């Protein structure tokens, strides 16, 4: 039971860590989007970064 309790606590800490992985309101890892697109050139063509949900 002590091992199970520790396991459940570490599991909840994973949720906290993933939800806090934001830089000024945007995240590539919290699961809230499928991708972020950054500018690649002056015409506005995108540099895609696929989201990796943690």
């Amino acid at each position: 039971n002590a091992l199970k309790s520790d396991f459940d606590s570490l599991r909840d800490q994973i949720t906290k860590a993933a939800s806090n992985a934001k830089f000024n309101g945007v995240s590539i890892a919290d699961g809230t989007t499928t991708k972020l697109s950054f500018l690649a050139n002056s015409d506005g063509s995108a540099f895609t970064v696929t989201a990796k949900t943690l």
């Binding site: 000024n24 309101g25 945007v26 972020l36 697109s37 950054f38 500018l39 002056s42 506005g44």
Partner: peptide, 13 residues
Amino acid sequence: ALAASDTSLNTAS
């Protein structure tokens, strides 16, 4: 306009 087309911006920016 080029900066505003980036989707990593938050709403205030």
